[PDB]
Amino acid sequence: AQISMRLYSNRDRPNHLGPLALERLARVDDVVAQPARQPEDGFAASEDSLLGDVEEYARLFTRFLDGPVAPLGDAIPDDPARRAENLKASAYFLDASMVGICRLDPDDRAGDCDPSHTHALVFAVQFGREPEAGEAGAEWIRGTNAARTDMRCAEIAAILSGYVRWMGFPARGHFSGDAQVDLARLAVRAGLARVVDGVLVAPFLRRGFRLGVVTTGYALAADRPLAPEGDLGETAPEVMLGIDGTRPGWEDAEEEKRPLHMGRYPMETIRRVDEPTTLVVRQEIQRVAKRGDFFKRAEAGDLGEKAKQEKKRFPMKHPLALGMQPLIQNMVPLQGTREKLAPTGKGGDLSDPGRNAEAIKALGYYLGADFVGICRAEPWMYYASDEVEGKPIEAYHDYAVVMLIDQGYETMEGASGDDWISASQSMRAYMRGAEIAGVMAAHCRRMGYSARSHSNAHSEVIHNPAILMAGLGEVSRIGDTLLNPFIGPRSKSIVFTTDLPMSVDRPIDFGLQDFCNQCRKCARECPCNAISFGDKVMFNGYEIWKADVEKCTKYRVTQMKGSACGRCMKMCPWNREDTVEGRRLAELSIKVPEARAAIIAMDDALQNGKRNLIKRWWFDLEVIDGVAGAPRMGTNERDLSPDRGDKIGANQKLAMYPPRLQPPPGTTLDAVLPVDRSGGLAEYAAAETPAAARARLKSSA
Ligand code: B12
Ligand code: SF4
Ligand code: SF4
Ligand SMILES: [Cl-]
Ligand code: NA
C-alpha cells in the first residue's frame, strides 16, 4: 500500500552528490546576476504560532556563525575537489536539501565580509510540510515556515563554519537573520536556483526553501549555474525513476497524501498491544540516581583514571563534532520549566486530547522528527536525584513526548561503527533532537502548559522506557537500545515532558522477541563483547537483555582508533536501506516467522555490514591539544567477524549494575564509588529468569 520508497539502491552513489539528481540538470559556466529574494510564507503567523520560538533558536545559533580559528595542522587535504566533496557531504549529513559551491568576487567582499574569503558553500533547506486546513495544529504552524527553515539554515551554517574553523581556516556562516553577503545572488551563481519574477526557484524544492552560506578562504572546487532558460531536465526518465538511487519524482506527491501527523513511515500498520512484549513490573522498579549513569561514573572516577581523563573528550575528537558542541551546550539553558503553569488561552482549542496528540505529532514532523510518539511520564521514568547537588528529582510532568532522529544509514554504511565519524553521528542526532524538542516545549509553555526537554547534555528522565511505552520500539538484544521496525536500532531519541493533555500511544509488537532470540549478530560484532549472547534476565523489575555497561563504557570513552562507538547499530539486520527490497525484508521479518532464521543467515551470507568504501566521505582527523591532525593510533576498519561458536551463551559472563550496585540516590560527582565488578558478575548469575518472575507474580494474582 506504501509505494513512495525507492526502487534503486544508492549504494554506488557518493554522499557529496546528495539525494537529488542535481548532476542531471542543464548547466552553463556563467549567468548574468539579477535581483532576487528568497521564498516566503503565503500567510502571516498569529500569536498562537510557533514563530517566537524558532526565532529564538535562530538567534541562539547566530552567536556561532563566527568563532575562534584553530591552528592549522599538517593533515588537511590540499585538493580542492576533495575538499569540495567533503564539505558538500557534510552539509547533506546535516540534512541540507541541496548544496553548491561558488567563488566570491570583489563586490561580495566589499561589504562587512572578511576580505580573505574567496569561496562560498551555499545550501538550501526545503520548507516543511504543513498541516492542511482544519487539521490539528494548523494554527500553530501556518506562516512560520521561513523562520522555521531559517532556523535550520543558521544551525547548519554555524556547524559547518565551525567545522572549517577547527580545521584551521577562517570561515563565517550566513543566513537571512545575519548575513554579510548576498544570499540570493550566491544561490544563483552556485547553481541551486534561478529567478522567476524576482523570486528564487530551485529545481525539486517545490515547497519553497531558505538559504545558508559559509564563506571561507578554504579553497574549494566550484559548481556551475543552472541553464537560465527552459527545461532543466527535472522530469527526464532517469530522474523520475531515480535510477542512480535518488529521490523518485513521484515521492513528493505520494507523501503529501498522508496526513502530516502520521509521519513518513507506516507505523499505523504495526500491531499495538496494551502492555509491552517484555515483562514490566512497575511496583518493583527502583528509581536510579543520575550519578549512576555510567558516563557520570566515569567522570567521577568510578571506572579508573583513563576513563576519567577521557570523559569530556571522547565524543569531541573530530572537528565536525566540535562544530556542533557550542550549539548543544548552549541549548541547555533553554530546556524549560519544571513548575506548573496556568493556561494562557493561546494555541486554539486544546480541549480534545486526541487532537492535541495529532497537533504535537504534526509539529514534530514539521520540525524534522523521524518518529513521534506520546506516553504517560510515569514516576519511575524520572531519575531519583541529580548528580551535581544530589537533590531529589520530582515527577513534575504528566506526559512524555518521545521523538526519534535517524542517525543516518548511508554514513554508517561507509563506517566501521567505532571510527572517526561515530560520535559525529551521535551528536548530529542529539543536536537536531534538542533543537526540535526545545522549540516544541517552548510552544507548550506559550500555551500555558509546563514543558521541559531532556537532552544528551541534560535529562531528568531515562529515555528507554518512554520509547517502549510510546510504541516506538521493542526491547532488543543490543540491550540499552530499543529497535524500531522501520529504522532498526539506528536512532537517537529526544524526550520532552509536558502537562499538555494528549491521548497516549500504545506499545508495539512486531515479532522482535522471537527474531532477536534467533540472531546474535550485534553480540558477535561488538568490539568488547559487551552484548549478551544469552537469554533475557530480570533487571530492576523488568525483563531485558542486559549488556555489560562497564565494558561498553570503557570501550567508547577510551578506545583510540576512533571517536566512541555504535557498531551494534550498524551490524543489525534491521539496519537497512530505504528501498523496496529493504522494506520487504522487514515486512517479511514482521509477518512471516518461518522466514526469520533465513533472513538472519542471509544477512551474513550476503555480507551485510561490510564497509562500503564509496560512502566514506569524512576525513580521519583527531584534534589533540587544540589542533586537528592525523589519528595518533590509527583507525578502526572492522569487517564481519566469525562465529564465537555454539556454547558462548552458556560461557559468557557479564556484569550487571542494578540499583544495589549503583551510587545511591543523593550521591554526587564529588564522591567516588569504584565499580564493583566481581559483585556485578555475581549479580548477573543470580538474576531471576523472566519465566520464574511470571510464575512468582501469578501466585499473587
Ligand atoms: C549513560 C548512557 C550510555 C552508557 C551507560 C548506560 C548505563 N546503563 O549506565 C553506555 C556507554 C553503556 C551507552 C551505550 C550506548 N548507548 Co547510551 N545512553 C546513556 C544515557 C545518556 C543515560 C542512561 C542511564 O541513565 N543509565 C543509568 C541507569 C538508568 O541504567 P540502567 O539502570 O542500566 O537502565 C538502562 C536500561 O535498562 C534502560 N531502562 C531503564 N529503565 C527501564 C525500563 C524498561 C521497561 C526498559 C525496557 C528499559 C529500561 O535504560 C537505561 C539505558 O542506559 C541514555 C539517555 C537517557 N537519558 O536515557 C543513553 C541511551 C540509552 N543510549 C543510546 C544509544 C543509542 C547508545 C549506543 C548504541 C551508543 C551510540 N553510538 O549511540 C550504545 C548502546 C549500548 C548497548 N549495548 O545498548 C540511546 C538509545 C536509543 C534507543 N533507540 O533505544 C539513548 C536513549 C540516548 C538517546 N537519547 O538516544 N550509553
Ligand atoms: S543484531 Fe540481531 S540480535 Fe542484535 S538486535 Fe539486531 S536483530 Fe536483535
Ligand atoms: S555495545 Fe558499546 S562497544 Fe559494543 S558495539 Fe555497541 S556501542 Fe560499541
Ligand atoms: Cl549513549
Ligand atoms: Na544491516
Author numbering: -3 to 697
Could you give the paper's own sentences about this structure?
The reductive dehalogenases (RDases) are key enzymes in organohalide respiration, which is performed by a unique subset of bacteria. The RDases are cobalamin-dependent and able to selectively cleave carbon-halogen bonds through reduction. The RDases can be split into two classes: (i) the canonical respiratory dehalogenases, which use a halogenated compound as a final electron acceptor during organohalide respiration and (ii) the catabolic respiratory dehalogenases that occur in the catabolic pathways of non-organohalide respiring bacteria. Structural insight into RDase function is based on two enzymes that have been crystallised, the respiratory perchloroethene (PCE) Sulfurospirillum multivorans reductive dehalogenase (PceA), and the catabolic reductive dehalogenase from Nitratireductor pacificus pht-3B (NpRdhA).
Crystals were obtained in 0.1 M Bis-Tris propane (pH 8.5), 0.2 M sodium nitrate and 20% w/v PEG3350, all with a regular rhombic shape and brown in colour. Crystals belonged to the same C2 space group as NpRdhAC crystals, but yielded a maximum resolution of 1.7Å, with a majority of the data sets diffracting at ~ 2.0 Å (as opposed to NpRdhAC crystals rarely diffracting better than 3.0 Å). The asymmetric unit (AU) contains three monomers that are very similar, with a pairwise alignment rmsd of 0.115–0.148 Å. An overlay of the crystal packing of both NpRdhAC and NpRdhAN reveals the relative position of molecules B and C is particularly affected by the distinct position of the affinity tag, the direct consequence being reduced mobility for these molecules and associated improved diffraction in the case of NpRdhAN. A comparison of the NpRdhAC and NpRdhAN structures by alignment of respective chain A monomers yields an rmsd of 0.148 Å over 614 residues, confirming the distinct position of the hexa-histidine tag has little effect on the protein structure. Furthermore, alignment of active site residues from NpRdhAC and NpRdhAN show excellent agreement with an rmsd of 0.092 Å for the 10 residues selected. A chloride ligand, likely derived from the purification buffer, is modelled as the β–axial ligand at a cobalt-chloride distance of 2.6 Å.
